[PDB]
DNA sequence: ATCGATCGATCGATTTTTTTTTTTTT
DNA sequence: ATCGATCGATCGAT
């Protein structure tokens, strides 16, 4: 997922928080303005049906070994597959 | 309310526990008797009780026992508090342990479910990896030195922190510390994990064990690798090692997310899965028992007679003690009976192996070596050189039987002979030094190299083994079998009745049990012949070996001087069977004659 | 778990060398692979027997140093008879 | 009648039939919510069925019993590795044998709570994936703002049992790895699935995040995924009365001692006296425990021997299928340590765990022996123990266990000749020791 | 300016696994086998604080074994000028943690022996040696800590004990003892009662015991400036006889010897007969040991029937008697181990009662060169004689009647007093 | 005006970790 | 680096 969808229940709306790389810091409480400045902040947790997802694959890539120097070692290369 | 809801069952049970569950009257076992369960308990004041769950299922018709089931953990306190209130009513440094038994049914680990939590449940299965005991707190003094502590109470749930109310004082607290062990009441505990039974598990899924801590006097009661009925106290504990499981593991959502796991407490367990002495006096009066003990020996076997007696004789050794300063003189005894295979010599070992307590047996070929030796075990891990006994130690002060020393070759014949000298043996490999105690009566059977005779064979070279291990065991007692048409019909008769589902009615004079208890009565004795007839035994040994000087091609041997030692232990075995101390020369003749035939088997 | 070889070569040919040096652990497996259509593991909690449809061919070297015409058949071979049968 | 509830549904009967044609879709769109109405409707569909028969099952409380659908055969899911992100929650047909079965995991339902006062027992259900406890308060009410006491033994629980499963969908893309599958399950679905068994078990897809530090609130990006285990489909005996009479009839038949033998190994040719033995052993012997001891059992073990590739091995391969508890092992691949007490570390719990050996699982039913001649000398000794005591004594490692093994066994023998050859000594020909042989 | 009493026998006589919270905090004498231990470390003894803002020396505080708290507000003022220890004017003491498992000879069958922590303070520290059979009088407690944040369930303080006292397996001379004890020494005929006190219950050869009396008594090395001390220990050898008391005698010496170790022949009795130890940093530190003789140095060797010994371990046989220092190739660690032990040997002759009239080189498969290290050869007999057993069997029968020599305490003290 | 609870800014503590040389067994 | 608790003040209540 690029952006979690939290839902306020009480105030509702929709929450979208960006996430990059391997991790993120999840928001809590309610950021919704209806719950803003009102004594009661709505509860929220991620809605997986709502939030958008991206397919993520990955692979190491070894050297052909003809490219390699006579010495040293084959170099594996981390790559990450995504989408179609 | 709920205070009284259990309080209701409390007085319901408190009166109930007061009430008599013993229906047996007159002859008995005439009531109460639960109050006597207190009384005899008040005799030793061990602060624990055995009580039947079934009887509570009786009077209340289980309706309260129903409360005993799921509402159990919640309702635990009302049991003893009223009991202690009953104690206060009756008995006088007070904390108690209750043990239920005779539960309606036993439940499998796979049978285990979450609905079973808070509910006492019977379970059984083999023990695994018991742990050493550590004291638990559950009641202690913990309070801040400022202004003063004064607080010892609660904090019983596993934390074990901490003090909350009327800190510090008098400043608001909470605050900090101070746990005082000087005033705390502690108990137990050792930790164990029951392995699920082998016959229960469908192959090959393997069983799933969970940790069972042993609280109460049930601690230390555990013998590892034993299937045992377990009283429930099912409960649960937080598991912080579950991650990537994943959850959902709910949080307090100061955040530590709850993950609770199955931990089955052991509240109660059973290892399963007077007038009798008059019988002795009734037995001790009988003269023919000396013959009768023999005929009562091993009816499953056919004949062989005198061989049987020695079995009993191996079952009661000599003084195996004294005489100072010093060395402790044996003691023990040994036999290895040999002859044509299908002699059913196996009848004897399997007889007493399932007969005498802690009687140990092996194929006597591949233990492999250790077996009796230390492995020595590796790795740990984190260490190495783990010292196993193994094998024949545990039979210590008991009769050990094996087969065909020629099958284990020489390699262990060394230590086998070693245990026969030093008794207890020292052992290790590249590990720490140790000397292990084995004092163990030993018999075995190694088939003849030809399995036949070879009557002209000197038993010395006939056995395919060294004289010292030979001279050490007194004595092997060879026997041979051949066709006798009278006996062939007797064998045809006697043996098939063994095959028979009936008649199984045929019996020896004694119940094996009544003699075994009689054995222990015979075990108590330390008959010592200081009688001058012992002097008569000397020339009897002189007359024993003066003839054996010529020739040496006969049963010699020498004869060994150790033979006189066993000649001692012979009478040591005799007097016990006869129950009289200091024995007699006529008895001395018996053991002497015993050796004679024992030795003559080496003749020809 | 990651399987291969026989499990990987099932429903296909398996070429093999050093067939005498496969020792026992292999021999029994392929001994069972001659029972074919199966691979049996009782190891761990794994009780499974999985189909191996593998086609089997292995070339193996005669007893050292090379084969001796004076040497009788089956004395020269380093493989078990039940394995050759 | 049974009051079993837990209906297994069918799927697909919504097609081809009308109506529900869209429900057939709508169930596949949102299976979770669909089961929610349907498990409840089954209750009323039962209650609606009972009102016609009026008083039923004593009486209205059996309707109070919960009913639920366990739908299966939803389309055809393609292996595992194919799975789409878009497939987030939908019913899935799957197949694989269980790699490992974890110990049952307890889960939250209704959390239990208390305050400093009075102390009072008021609590609230776990409900959502969160537990929200009021700062205060019940009793005295009041307030006051005491910490909320939680006794977890009082609160509700249910079983969720994790199983890692490696599916074998075949059709493997190559070079794709033998991917496995995560599962949680619930209730009866819990523990009802034996490990190592290829199964049709179906469920919606599921993926959920996990804290990276497992301290910090931070979750790691993309969510880990597991099966919803919606439904399962793996693949004392009580015989009906009539064929039992056919047993009494077949017993009246003259050739049953023979005619059964031809049916014992119909695939096998001749060697009937050999079949005759196979015929006897299965029924071999009867228990005599006497007053005490005894127990010679019925257990009888006869070793087969002769020409190589006599298809002697096809019998045991065949007999292995026959016995309810059977045993088959090749020579030299099986070891005396493999016959009893493995006692390996569990290694997931990081603690050594004892395991019954070949002979222990051998215990009960028939056991076949390959290369008994080729068997190690440490081998047959554990067996001689079995040959006599009919039991296995394990004192090794941490604990002493003398365990009973009572089971039939038959060994395959290959003569060293390999031909047994004419004349010669008999026993010396078979190899092995006379004590072992006799 | 300090001492504490070790005191005396205090049953207890409890083993290991049998102990309870009933036994906690109250002194409990305990038995167990010595095991691996840490090196001796300095102990905080008396705490003192140079503090921070508040001034030195503030005076020493008494802590701790082992707590030392809490220094909240003091010495001036309070904090942040808070208490901290300084190297000056602070008394310390030796400290050693130790592992002692319960004795295997006392080990219940098939059950694994339990590990126990062994605390050492003051004189008690380092006095113990690993692998020793020993007694300890400690105080069992839940001590200490308890965190152990790992457990948790069920909450406990992991048990630990420090024995006030320790005793080897299982005595010393004093003035009034030795003084009259000296008066015993003046007699010349004492030599005989040394045979008389040799093995009084054994009878046996007065001659065989003579050799026993020899190595048993020990002797000066003696050093040669600045080179070899030669050999002050006797290598004892016994040619055995079947049925003879020979194996029994060395056992007499066993409880006789102050320091003694008996590994018998092999198969193998404790332990490896040689140093096999390789480390292994990792794991955790591993452990290092030598040959069987490493266990007792200056103490006499006890072995029998080398014929049953492996040739590899038998190399260390001729090895030990030679250089009188132990050495081996495994592995990375490099040292020179010096072990001096009198060496006893009794092995049964090949075959029958007497191997051959021909020279014992014919008698024994064992090489003379390895036998050469043996200064004393104990040969026994004999073919049956009439009065021979009358001289013994009558002696023996009267021996078993139980149910001249010096008291063993004196005679055992005599040699140790002498060797010292 | 005394008392409180309330929020916030103050303070400070917690974030990686198992493989190659071995060794008693036949 | 962020989260965690201490602790400080302030604005309302009685
Ligand atoms: N001269 C003797 N005086 C008293 N007792 C003796 C004598 N010779 C032998 N014995 C008795 O015989 C037994 C000999 O056992 P010991 O412990 O010496 O093993 P061993 O006979 O040396 O073993 P092996 O001869 O096989 O090496 C002892 O119990 C001892 O009482």
Task: Name the residue in chain D with its Cα closest to that of E112.
Answer: D398
Sole residue written with tokens 């003379």: E368
Helix (H, G, I), strand (E, B) or coil at D331: coil
Contact B404, B446 (CB under 8 A): yes
Cα–Cα distance between B230 and B212 in angstroms, integer?
A: 10
The answer to whether the CB of B263 falls within 8 A of the CB of B212 is yes
CA-based torsion, D213, D215, D216, D217: positive or negative: positive
For residue B261, CA distances in Å to B242, B471, D184, D326 come to: 9, 61, 15, 36
Distance of CA B268 to the CA centre of its chain: 19
- Find the helix or strand (DSSP H, E) in which B336 lies: strand B334-336
CA distance B264 to B233: 7
Q: For Cα atoms B20, B24, B28, give the angle at the middle one, nearest 5 degrees.
A: 105
- Which residue in chain A is spatially nearest to D84 when comparing CA positions? A55
Q: How far is CA E187 from CA B85, E174, E182, E183, in A?
A: 78, 21, 10, 8
E to C contact (≥3 Cβ pairs closer than 8 Å): no
Q: Is B314 helix (H, G, I), strand (E, B) or coil?
A: helix
Residues 6+ apart with CB under 8 A from A72: none
Distance set, CA D249 to CA B448, D237, D253 (Å): 53, 21, 6
Give the phi and the psi of residue B373 in degrees, each rounded to 5: -75, 165
Q: In angstroms, rounded to a whole number, what is the distance separating the alpha carbons of residues B308 and E49?
A: 81
Question: Distance from the CA of E248 to the center of ligand 1, in angstroms?
Answer: 6
The neighbour count for residue E10, using CB atoms within 10 Å, is 13
Residues belonging to the binding site of B for ATP are: 339-346
Distance CA D357, CA D337 (A): 7
3-state secondary structure string across D362-374: HCCCCEEECCCCC
Count of CA atoms in the C-beta half-sphere (13 A) of A49: 6
Sequence-ordered list of residues with C-beta below 8 angstroms from that of E372, at least 6 positions apart, any chain: none
Asked if D307 and D413 count as a contact pair (C-beta separation under 8 A), the reply is: no
Helices (H), E197-240: 206-217
d(CA B232, CA B69): 9
Tell how far the Cα of E249 is from the centroid of ligand 1, in angstroms: 8
List chains touching B (3+ CB pairs under 8 A).
C, D, E
Cis peptide before D142 (omega within 30 of 0): yes
**Which residue blocks in E130-199 are alpha helix, DSSP H?**
175-185, 190-196
CA of E351 to the centre of ligand 1 (A): 17
User: Strand F and chain B: which residues 364-393 have CB closer than 7 Å?
Assistant: 368-370, 373, 375-376, 385
Give the position, in ligand 1's atom list, of the atom nearest the Cα of B417.
26
Crossing angle between the packed helical segments B34-44 and B2-18, to the nearest 10 degrees: 80
The contacts of residue E247 (CB under 8 Å, 6+ apart) are B421, B422, E240, E304, E346
Query: Are A24 and D219 an interchain contact pair (Cβ–Cβ within 8 Å)?
Result: yes
Listed as ranges, the nucleotides of chain F within 7 A of a protein C-beta are: 6, 14-15, 21-26
Q: Does A48 touch chain D (CB under 8 A)?
A: yes
By CB atoms closer than 10 A (0-12, 13-18, 19+), residue E196 is: middle
Q: What distance in Å separates the CA atoms of residue A8 and residue D395, rounded to the nearest whole number?
A: 63
Stated in angstroms to one decimal place, the resolution of this structure is 6.1
Question: Which chain C residues contact residue B206 at CB under 8 A?
Answer: 45
Closest-CA residue to C7 (of B232, D166, D235): D166
Strand runs labelled E in E348-419? 376-378
Name the 3-class secondary structure at B5: helix
Angle CA B442–B445–B449, to nearest 5: 140
Coil vs helix vs strand at B517: helix
Task: Give the whole-angstrom CA distance, residue B196 versus residue E42.
Answer: 49
Q: Which helix (H) or strand (E) holds B180?
A: strand B178-184
- B198: closest CA of chain C, how far (Å): 14
**Residue B19: phi, psi to the nearest 5?**
-65, 155
Task: State whether the beta carbon of E190 lies below 7 angstroms from any atom of strand F.
Answer: no
Task: Enumerate residues 334 to 363 of chain B having a beta carbon within 8 A of any beta carbon in chain E.
Answer: none
Query: For tokens 């038995």, what's the residue?
Result: E31
All residues at 6 or more sequence positions from B520 whose CB lies less than 8 Å from its CB, including other chains = none
Among residues B493, B512, B478, B495, the alpha carbon closest in space to that of B603 is found at: B478
ω before D137 within 30° of 0 (cis)? yes
- Sign of the CA dihedral running B245, B250, B255, B260: negative
Residue E109 at interface with chain D, using a CB cutoff of 8 Å: yes
- Give the N- to C-terminal CA distance of chain D in Å, as an integer: 59
Q: Which long-range contacts (CB under 8 A, 24 or more apart) does D213-220 make?
A: D214/B243, D216/A25, D217/A25, D217/A26, D217/B255, D218/A23, D218/A24, D218/A25, D218/A26, D219/A23, D219/A24, D219/A26, D220/A22, D220/A23
> Which one, of D284, D294, D288, lies nearest residue D408 by Cα?
D284
| CA distance readout (Å), B381 to B386, B428, D345, E333, E420 | 10, 18, 11, 22, 43
Closest-CA residue to E342 (of E380, E306, E376): E376
DSSP B282-303: HHHH-STHHHHHHHTT-TTS--
Whether the Cβ atoms of residue D373 and residue D413 lie closer than 8 Å to each other: yes
Q: Do chains E and A touch (3 or more CB pairs under 8 A)?
A: no
Question: Is the CB of E348 within 6 Å of ligand 1?
Answer: yes
Q: How far apart are the C-alpha atoms of D78 and D179, rounded to whole Å? A: 13
Quickly tell me which residue has 């790795």 as its tokens.
B379
- CA–CA gap between residue D362 and residue D383 (Å, rounded): 11
Of D329, D332, D333, D357, the C-alpha closest to D343 is D357
B110 Cα to chain C: minimum distance (Å):
16
In whole angstroms, give the CA distance from residue E343 to residue E293: 9
Which one-letter DSSP state was computed for residue E270? S
Cα distance between residue E143 and residue B135, in whole Å: 10
The whole-angstrom separation of Cα D415 and Cα D306 is: 6
Nearest to E328 by CA among E301, E302, E290, E272: E290
Taking alpha carbons only, the member of B338, B603, B600 closest to residue B480 is B338
Q: Which CATH class is domain B106-134+188-239+259-273?
A: mainly beta
Nearest to E190 by CA among E18, E359, E9, E405: E405
CA distance B380 to B384: 5
Residue B599 CA to ligand 1 center (angstroms) comes to: 20
Give the containing element (helix H, strand E) for D276: helix D272-282
Task: Identify the helix (H) or strand (E) that includes residue E196.
Answer: helix E190-196
Q: CB of residue B202 closer than 7 A to nucleic acid strand G?
A: no
CA dihedral of D248, D252, D258, D264, whole degrees rounded to 10? -20
Residue D108 contacts residue D154 (beta carbons within 8 Å): no
- The H-or-E segment that residue E94 falls in is strand E93-101
CB-CB neighbors (< 8 A) of D377 in chain B: 365-366
- Angle between helix axes B512-523 and B562-578 (nearest 10 degrees) is 120
- Burial of D409 from C-beta contacts in 10 A (0-12 / 13-18 / 19+): buried
β partners of residue A16: A5
For chain B, the structural domain boundaries read 1-105, 106-134+188-239+259-273, 135-187, 274-604
Token pair recorded at residue B590: 């018996």
3-state SS class at B358: coil
Tell me how long chain A is: 84
E strand map for D131-269: 157-160, 163-167, 205-208, 224-227
Phi and psi at residue E389, in whole multiples of 5°? -80, -30
In eight-state DSSP terms, residue D219 is B
Residue D179 contacts residue D167 (beta carbons within 8 Å): yes
Any ligand 1 atom below 6 A from CB of B422: no
Smallest Cα–Cα separation from E258: which of E126, E412, E411, E129? E412
Listed residue (B54, B67, B68) closest to B21, CA to CA: B54
SS3 call for E211: helix
CA B383 to CA E287: how far, in whole Å?
8
For chain E, the distance separating the N- and C-terminal CA atoms, rounded to the nearest angstrom, is 29
How far apart are the CA of B1 and the nearest CA of chain D, in angstroms? 11
Are E246 and E199 in contact by the 8 Å Cβ rule? The answer is no
DSSP 8-state assignment for residue E117: E
Q: Does residue B421 line the site of ligand 1, with CB under 6 A?
A: yes
Return the sign of the alpha-carbon dihedral for residues D423, D428, D432, D436: positive
The DSSP line for E7-30 is ----S--B-SS---TTTBTSEEEE
Pair D410, D368: CB distance under 8 Å: yes
Residue indicated by tokens 């037995």: B283
Going by the DSSP 8-state scheme, the letter that residue D342 receives in this structure is: -
User: Is C61 annotated as contributing to ligand binding?
Assistant: yes
For B139, B143, B252, the CA distances from B238, given in Å and listed in that order, are 21, 26, 13
319-348 in D: which are within 8 Å (CB) of B? Answer: 325, 336, 346
Conformation bin of residue B564: beta by default, left when phi > 0, alpha when psi is -120 to 50 = alpha
List CB contacts (< 8 A) between A26 and chain D. 217-219
E241, E305 contact by CB (below 8 A): no
Whether the CB-CB separation of B518 and E370 falls below 8 Å is answered with no
Which residue lies with its CA nearest to atom 24 of ligand 1? E242
Q: Is B435 on the interface with E (CB under 8 A)?
A: yes
Compute the distance between CA of residue D164 and CA of residue D183 in angstroms, rounded to an integer: 6
- Asked whether A11 and A34 are in contact (CB, 8 A), the reply is yes
Interface test with E, best of B330, B412, B435, B568 (most E CBs within 10 A): B435
Q: What token pair was written down for E199?
A: 């093995």
Q: What residues contact D212, with CB distance under 8 A and at least 6 apart?
A: A22, A23, D218, D219, D220
Instruction: Tell me, letter by letter, the H, E, C secondary structure of D233-255.
Output: CCCCCCCCHHHHHHHHHHHHCCC
Output the distance from E86 CA to F16 C1' rounded to whole Å: 35
Quick check: B71 and D154 in contact, CB under 8 A? no
Q: At what angle do helices D256-264 and D272-282 cross, to 10 degrees?
A: 100
Known binding residues of B? 339-346
Q: How far is CA D224 from CA B115, B244, D89, D207, in A?
A: 29, 8, 14, 5
Can you tell me the distance from the alpha carbon of D213 to that of B256, in angstroms, rounded to the nearest whole number? Answer: 12
Q: Terminus-to-terminus CA distance in chain C, angstroms?
A: 33
Report helix, strand or coil for B353. Answer: helix
**Neighbouring C-beta atoms of residue E48, cutoff 10 Å:** 24
Neighbours of B521 (CB within 10 A): 19
Packing angle between helix B306-315 and helix B562-578, nearest 10 degrees? 90
Using CA atoms, how far apart are residues B89 and B83, in angstroms rounded to an integer? 9
How far is it between the farthest Cα atoms of chain B? 103
Domain B274-604 class in CATH: alpha beta
For residue A53, give how far its alpha carbon lies from the nearest alpha carbon of chain D (Å).
7
CA distance B579 to E285: 59
Count of C-beta atoms within a 10 Å radius of residue B187: 20
Distance, Å, D143 CA → G13 C1': 18
Q: In what order do the strands lie in the sheet with B190-195?
A: B126-128, B190-195, B210-214
Residue B537 three-state SS = helix
What are B93's two structure tokens? 């440094």
Does residue E408 sit in helix, strand or coil?
A: helix
**By the 8 A CB rule, do B132 and B188 touch?**
no
Check if E396 has its Cβ closer than 6 Å to any atom of ligand 1. yes
Residues of D in contact with A40 (CB under 8 A): none
- Those residues whose C-beta lies under 8 Å from the C-beta of residue B130, and which sit 6 or more positions away, are B190, B191, B192, B222, B224
Q: Are C26 and C80 in contact (CB under 8 A)?
A: no
Radius of gyration of chain B (CA): 32
Tell me which residue has tokens 């006890």. Answer: E302
Q: At what angle do helices B562-578 and B585-600 cross, to 10 degrees?
A: 130
Mutate to test the interface with C, among D333, D344, D355 (most CBs of C within 10 A): D333
Q: Smallest CA–CA separation between B272 and chain C, in Å?
A: 29
- Rounded distance between C-alpha atoms, residue E320 and residue E339, angstroms: 8
Of D101, D309, D332, the CB nearest to C24: D332
Which chain E residues are within 8 Å of B434, Cβ to Cβ?
A: 33, 104-105, 270-271
D99 in reach of chain C (CB within 8 A): yes
* Tokens describing residue E1: 């300016």
- Backbone breaks in chain D after residues (C–N over 2.5 Å): 235
Query: Token pair for residue B227?
Result: 């299937």
**Residue C23 C-alpha to ligand 1 middle, in angstroms?**
51
**Contact present, D99 and D210 (Cβ < 8 Å):** no
E267 strand F contact, CB < 7 Å: no
Record: contact C45-B203, CB cut-off 8 A: no
Q: Which residue is nearest to nucleotide F16 (CA to C1')?
A: D213
CATH number corresponding to B1-105: 3.30.1640.10
User: Helix, strand, coil % (nearest 5) of chain A?
Assistant: 0, 25, 75
Strands E236-239 and E343-347: parallel
Q: Six-digit token pair at B504?
A: 């199984």
Q: Where are the beta strands (DSSP E) in C19-63?
A: 55-58
Instruction: Say yes or no: Cβ of E115 under 7 A from any atom of strand F.
Output: no
Touching chains B and D? (3+ Cβ pairs < 8 A)? yes
Site of tokens 């934390």: B159
Q: Say how many Å lie between the CA of residue E243 and the centre of ligand 1.
A: 5
Q: Which residue of D has its CA nearest to B252?
A: D131
What are E74's two structure tokens? 């003091």
Question: Can you name the residues that pair with E300 across neighbouring β-strands?
Answer: E260
Q: Which chains touch E (3 or more CB pairs under 8 A)?
A: B, D
CB atoms within 10 A of CB D360: 25
Q: Which residue of D has its CA nearest to B223?
A: D399
CB E406 within 8 A of CB E197: yes
Distance CA B467, CA E412 (A): 35
């Amino acid at each position: 997922v690029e952006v979690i969808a939290y839902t306020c229940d009480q105030c509702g709306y929709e929450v979208f928080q960006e996430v990059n790389s391997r991790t993120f810091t999840p928001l809590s409480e309610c950021t919704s303005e209806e719950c803003s400045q009102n004594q009661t902040k709505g509860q929220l947790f991620m809605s997986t049906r709502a939030s958008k997802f991206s397919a993520f694959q990955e692979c190491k890539i070894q050297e052909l070994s003809q490219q390699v120097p006579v010495g040293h070692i084959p170099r594996s290369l981390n790559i990450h597959v995504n989408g179609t | 309310v709920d205070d009284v809801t259990g309080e209701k069952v409390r007085e319901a049970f408190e009166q109930f526990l007061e009430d008599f569950s013993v229906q047996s009257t007159d002859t008995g076992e005439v009531e109460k008797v639960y109050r006597a369960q207190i009384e005899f308990m008040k005799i030793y004041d061990l602060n624990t009780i055995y009580i039947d769950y079934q009887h509570l299922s009786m009077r209340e018709n289980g309706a309260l026992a129903m409360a005993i089931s799921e509402q159990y953990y919640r309702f635990l306190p009302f049991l003893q508090k009223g009991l202690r209130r009953v104690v206060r009513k009756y008995a006088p440094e007070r904390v108690f342990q209750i043990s239920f038994f005779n539960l309606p049914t036993v439940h499998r680990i796979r049978d285990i479910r979450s609905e079973k939590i808070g509910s006492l449940l019977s379970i059984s299965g083999t023990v695994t990896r018991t742990s050493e005991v550590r004291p638990e707190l559950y009641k202690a003094s913990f309070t801040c030195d400022m202004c003063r502590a004064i607080v010892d109470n609660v904090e019983q749930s596993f934390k074990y922190t901490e003090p909350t109310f009327c800190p510090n004082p008098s400043c608001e607290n909470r605050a900090f510390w101070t746990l005082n062990v000087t005033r705390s009441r502690f108990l137990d505990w050792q930790k164990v994990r029951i392995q699920e039974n082998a016959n229960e598990i469908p192959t090959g899924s393997m069983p799933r064990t969970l940790d069972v801590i042993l609280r109460g006097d049930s601690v230390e009661r555990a013998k590892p690798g034993d299937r045992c009925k377990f009283t429930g106290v099912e409960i649960v504990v937080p598991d912080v090692t579950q991650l990537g499981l994943p959850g959902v593991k709910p949080s307090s959502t100061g955040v530590r997310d709850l993950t609770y796991k199955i931990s089955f407490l052991a509240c109660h367990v059973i290892s399963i899965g007077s007038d009798e002495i008059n019988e002795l006096k009734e037995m001790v009066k009988d003269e023919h028992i000396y013959d009768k003990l023999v005929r009562s020996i091993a009816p499953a076997v056919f004949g062989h007679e005198a061989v049987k007696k020695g079995i009993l004789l191996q079952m009661l050794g000599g003084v195996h003690k004294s005489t100072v300063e010093g060395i402790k003189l044996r003691g023990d005894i040994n036999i290895c009976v040999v002859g044509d295979p299908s002699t059913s010599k196996s009848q004897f070992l399997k007889y007493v192996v399932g007969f005498a307590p802690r009687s140990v047996y092996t194929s006597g070929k591949a233990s492999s070596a250790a077996g009796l030796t230390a492995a020595v075990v590796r790795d740990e891990e984190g260490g190495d050189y783990t010292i196993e006994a193994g094998a024949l130690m545990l039979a210590d002060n008991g009769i050990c039987c094996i087969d065909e020393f020629d099958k284990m070759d020489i390699s262990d014949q060394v230590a086998i002979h070693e245990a026969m000298e030093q008794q207890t043996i020292s052992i290790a490999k590249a590990g720490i030094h140790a000397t292990l105690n084995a004092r163990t009566s030993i018999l075995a059977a190694a088939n003849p190299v030809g399995g036949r005779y070879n009557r002209k064979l000197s038993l010395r070279g006939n056995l395919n083994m060294t004289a010292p291990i030979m001279s050490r065991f007194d004595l092997f007692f060879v026997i041979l079998d051949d066709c006798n048409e009278k006996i062939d019909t007797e064998l045809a008769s006697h043996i098939v009745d063994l095959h028979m589902k009936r008649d199984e009615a045929i019996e020896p004079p004694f119940s094996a049990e009544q003699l075994r208890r009689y054995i222990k009565y015979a075990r108590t004795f330390k008959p010592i012949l200081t009688k001058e007839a012992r002097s008569y035994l000397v020339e009897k040994y002189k007359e024993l070996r003066k003839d054996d000087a010529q020739g040496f091609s006969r049963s010699s041997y020498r004869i060994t001087v150790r033979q006189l030692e066993s000649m001692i232990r012979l009478s040591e075995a005799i007097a016990r069977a006869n129950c009289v101390d200091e024995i007699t020369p006529s008895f001395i003749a018996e053991a002497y004659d015993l050796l004679r035939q024992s030795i003559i088997r080496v003749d020809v | 778990l990651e399987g291969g070889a026989l499990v990987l070569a099932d429903n296909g040919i398996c070429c093999i060398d050093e067939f005498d040096k496969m020792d026992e652990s292999d021999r029994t497996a392929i001994h069972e692979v001659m029972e074919q259509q199966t691979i049996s593991i009782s190891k761990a909690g794994i009780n499974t027997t999985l189909n191996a449809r593998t086609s089997i061919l292995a070339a193996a070297n005669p007893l050292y140093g090379r084969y001796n015409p004076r040497l009788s058949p089956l004395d020269n071979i380093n493989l078990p008879a039940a394995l050759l049968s | 009648e049974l009051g079993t509830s837990n209906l297994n549904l069918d799927a697909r009967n919504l097609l081809a039939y009308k109506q529900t044609e869209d429900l057939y879709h709508q169930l596949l769109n949102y299976p979770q919510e669909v089961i929610s109405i349907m498990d409840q409707t089954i209750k009323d569909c039962m209650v609606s069925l009972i009102v016609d028969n009026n008083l039923d099952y004593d009486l209205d409380e059996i309707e109070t019993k919960f009913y639920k659908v366990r739908p299966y055969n939803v389309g055809s899911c393609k292996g595992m590795r194919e799975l789409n992100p878009n497939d987030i929650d939908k019913l899935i047909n799957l197949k694989g044998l269980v790699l490992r079965s974890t110990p049952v995991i307890p889960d939250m339902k209704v959390a239990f709570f208390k305050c400093n006062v009075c102390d009072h027992t008021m609590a609230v259900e776990i409900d959502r994936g969160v537990i929200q406890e009021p700062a205060r308060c019940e009793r005295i009410d009041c307030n006051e703002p005491n910490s909320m006491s939680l006794i977890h033994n009082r609160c509700s629980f249910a079983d969720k049992q994790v199983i890692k499963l490696q599916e074998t969908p075949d059709f493997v893309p190559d070079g794709q790895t033998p991917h496995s599958i995560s599962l949680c399950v619930y209730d009866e679905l819990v523990d009802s699935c034996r490990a190592g068994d290829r199964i049709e078990v179906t469920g919606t897809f599921r993926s959920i995040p996990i804290r990276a530090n497992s301290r910090q609130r931070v979750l790691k990006s993309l969510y880990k995924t597991y099966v919803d285990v919606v439904h399962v489909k793996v693949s004392v005996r009580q015989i009906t009365d009539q064929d039992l009479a056919k047993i009494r009839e077949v017993a009246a038949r003259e050739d049953l001692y023979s005619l059964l033998a031809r049916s014992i190994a119909p695939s096998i040719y001749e060697l009937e006296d050999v079949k005759k033995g196979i015929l006897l052993q299965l029924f071999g012997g009867t228990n005599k425990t006497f007053t005490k001891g005894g127990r010679y059992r019925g257990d009888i073990n006869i070793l087969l021997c002769g020409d190589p590739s006599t298809s002697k091995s096809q019998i045991l391969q065949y007999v292995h299928k026959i016995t309810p508890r059977g045993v088959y092992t090749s020579g030299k691949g099986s070891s005396a340590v493999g016959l009893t007490a493995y006692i390996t570390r569990d290694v997931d719990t990081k603690q050594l765990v004892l395991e019954s050996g070949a002979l222990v699982l051998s215990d009960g039913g028939v056991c076949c022996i390959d290369e008994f001649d080729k068997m190690s000398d440490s081998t047959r000794s554990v067996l001689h123990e079995v040959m006599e005591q009919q039991t296995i004594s394990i004192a090794k490692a941490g604990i002493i266990t003398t365990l009973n093994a009572r089971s039939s066994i038959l060994a395959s023998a290959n003569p060293i000749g390999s031909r047994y050859n004419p004349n010669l000594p008999v026993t010396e020909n078979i190899d092995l020791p006379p004590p072992l042989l006799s | 300016s300090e001492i504490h009493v070790r005191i005396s026998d205090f049953p207890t006589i409890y083993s290991l696994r049998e102990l309870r919270e009933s036994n906690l905090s109250s002194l409990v004498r305990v038995t167990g086998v010595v095991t691996r231990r840490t090196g001796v470390f300095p102990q905080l003894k008396y705490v003192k604080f140079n503090c921070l803002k508040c001034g030195s020396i503030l005076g020493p505080f008494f802590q701790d074994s082992n707590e030392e708290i809490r220094i909240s507000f003091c010495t001036n003022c309070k904090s942040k000028g808070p208490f901290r220890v300084n190297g000056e004017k602070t008394v310390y003491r030796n400290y050693q943690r130790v592992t002692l498992q319960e004795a295997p000879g006392t080990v219940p069958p098939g059950r694994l022996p339990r590990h126990r922590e062994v605390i050492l303070l003051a004189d008690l520290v380092d006095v113990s040696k690993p692998g020793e059979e020993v007694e300890v009088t400690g105080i069992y407690k839940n001590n200490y800590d308890g965190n152990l944040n790992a457990k948790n369930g069920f909450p406990v303080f992991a048990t630990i004990i420090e024995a006030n006292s320790i005793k080897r397996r299982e005595f010393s001379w004093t003035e009034e003892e030795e003084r009259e004890f000296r008066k015993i020494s003046r007699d010349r005929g004492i030599i005989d009662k040394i045979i008389s006190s040799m093995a009084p219950s054994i009878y046996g050869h007065r001659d065989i015991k003579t050799a026993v009396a020899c190595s048993l008594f020990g002797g000066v090395p003696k050093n040669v400036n600045g080179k070899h001390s030669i050999r002050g220990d006797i290598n004892v050898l016994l040619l055995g006889d079947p049925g003879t008391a020979k194996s029994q005698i060395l056992k007499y010496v066993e409880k006789t010897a102050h320091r003694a170790v008996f590994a018998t022949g092999q198969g193998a009795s404790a332990v490896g007969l040689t140093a096999s130890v390789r480390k292994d940093p990792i794991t955790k530190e591993w452990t290092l040991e030598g040959g069987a003789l490493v266990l007792a140095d200056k103490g006499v060797c006890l072995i029998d029937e080398f014929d049953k010994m492996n040739d590899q371990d038998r190399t260390s046989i001729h090895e030990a008697m030679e250089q009188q220092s132990i050495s081996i190739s495994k592995a990375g660690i490099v040292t020179t181990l010096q072990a001096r032990c009198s060496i006893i040997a009794a092995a049964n002759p090949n075959g029958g009662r007497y191997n051959s009239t021909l020279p014992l080189a014919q008698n024994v498969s064992l090489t003379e060169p390895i036998l050469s290290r043996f200064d004393i050869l104990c040969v026994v007999r004999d073919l049956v004689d009439e009065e021979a057993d009358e001289r013994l069997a009558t002696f023996v029968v009267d021996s078993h009647v139980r149910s001249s020599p010096i008291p063993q305490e004196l005679l055992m003290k005599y040699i140790h007093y002498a060797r010292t």
